[PDB]
């Protein structure tokens, strides 16, 4: 998230993430981030 | 926590050339963009310059167009600004600004600063 | 261009006082202002980027607000390490990074 | 062990009576089924 | 965009009989295959 | 079965969604379970007739 850069949307970039404790807190509490809105899940259990 | 080390300052005659280098340490500059600004010594703070993160994008000052050429060496992590033709007006304090974003012209600021060098053009 | 004027020049309080320090802009920028804090004896610092986002290690007393033309900057504790000269920056129009005068600030 | 607890592994909820289980899993199986579809042998994350 | 391999080990054309191949090893590579070649040794 | 909802596990739907579309998915599943009870019970009411 706190990447400098992007890439572009047909060469979009994929990044991989496992064995690892996920806290989604830190998404959750910051303004910026206005779109929020998930499928299949709802937010708030994200935590558990 | 992040270090802007700069050198090349002095005093010069007007009509001569010096040159500047600012080094940093403290974080990965390869996506970075820079910018050199000035200050008078009597007066506020002033933008000079600036480079992105790899040399595409180069932006000077309308008063110095022609003059001021920018440089950076990505592998040694470091910035150099060579001032050319130097007059009495340009014996102000020199900072070396890191931009937050990657590109030269983007609403995104300066977020760390370093120690200004001191320049003098006269005799 | 762009012409970006200081209505206070030099103010004064003690350490238990809330200042404000206003800038304005001749144009709309669209709440691309920055602020930035320059210590007489070291380099300067910035303060807030963008209109109201403040910048992280540093103390939550400043508070940016404003909007269009002017903008707007609060302390609300003046710790005795708040005297500096304090910029305006604008980052919008075509000069590029064109800065403000300067705002003395002095405790009394 | 042995009594009715209300158990959550790895984010699979139920009540139940934990007991030991004689059954063979492969090295890999990770869960189990019955022939009625009903989750009745598990494998501990913290302790295989 | 995983790549599962099975295997199995048996002490003995193809011998008639019925063997499970237990799920060996998950590769996580995402690419795309369509041609391939063994390994020998000489 | 899961008779149209997501997954066929009560305790996964609680422990995934949150109660407004919850409650849509359980509904589900509850009406899908009470018709198959209905056509056991009448298959075993002609069949003990």
């Known amino acids: 998230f706190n990447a400098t850069r992007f890439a572009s949307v047909y060469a979009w970039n994929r990044k991989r993430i496992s064995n690892c404790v996920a806290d989604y807190s830190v998404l959750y509490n910051l303004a910026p981030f206005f779109t929020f809105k998930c499928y299949g899940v709802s937010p708030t259990k994200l935590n558990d | 926590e992040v270090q802007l080390v700069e050198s090349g300052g002095g005093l010069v005659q007007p009509g001569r050339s010096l040159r500047l280098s600012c080094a940093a340490s403290?974080?990965?500059?390869?996506?970075?963009?820079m910018h050199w600004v000035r200050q008078a010594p009597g007066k506020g703070l002033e933008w000079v310059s600036g480079?992105?993160?790899?040399?595409?994008?180069?932006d000077y000052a309308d008063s110095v167009k022609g003059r001021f050429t920018i440089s950076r060496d990505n592998a040694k992590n470091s910035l150099y600004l060579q001032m050319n033709s130097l007059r009495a007006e340009d014996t102000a304090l020199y900072y070396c600004?890191?931009?937050?974003?990657?590109?030269?012209?983007?609403?995104?600021?300066?977020?760390?600063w370093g120690q200004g060098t001191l320049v003098t053009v006269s005799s | 261009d762009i012409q970006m004027t200081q209505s206070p020049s030099s103010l004064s309080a003690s350490v238990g006082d809330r200042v404000t320090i206003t800038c304005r802009a001749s144009?709309?920028?669209?709440?691309?202002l920055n602020w930035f804090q320059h210590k007489p004896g070291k380099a300067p610092k910035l303060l807030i980027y963008?209109?109201?986002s403040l910048q992280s290690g540093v103390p939550s007393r400043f508070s940016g607000s404003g909007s269009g033309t002017d903008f707007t900057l609060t302390i609300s504790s003046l710790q005795p390490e708040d005297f500096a000269t304090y910029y305006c920056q604008q980052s919008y129009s075509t000069p590029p990074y064109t800065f403000g005068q300067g705002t003395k600030l002095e405790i009394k | 062990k042995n009594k009715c607890v209300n158990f959550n592994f790895n984010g699979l909820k139920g009540t139940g009576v934990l007991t030991e289980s004689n059954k063979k899993f492969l090295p890999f199986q990770q869960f189990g089924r019955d022939i009625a579809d009903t989750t009745d042998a598990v494998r501990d994350p913290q302790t295989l | 965009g995983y790549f599962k391999i099975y295997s199995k080990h048996t002490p003995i054309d193809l011998p008639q009989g019925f063997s499970a191949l237990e799920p060996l090893v998950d590769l996580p590579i995402g690419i795309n295959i369509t041609r391939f070649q063994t390994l020998l040794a000489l | 079965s899961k008779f149209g909802a997501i997954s066929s596990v009560l305790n996964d739907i609680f422990s995934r969604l949150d109660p407004p579309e919850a409650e849509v998915q359980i509904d589900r599943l509850i009406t899908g379970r009470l018709q198959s009870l209905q056509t056991y019970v009448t298959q075993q009411l002609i069949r003990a007739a």
């Open positions: 600004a890191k931009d937050r974003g990657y590109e030269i012209l983007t609403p995104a600021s300066f977020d760390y």
């Open positions: 963008g209109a109201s």
């Open positions: 144009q709309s920028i669209s709440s691309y």
């Open positions: 480079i992105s993160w790899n040399s595409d994008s180069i």
């Open positions: 403290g974080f990965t500059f390869d996506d970075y963009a």
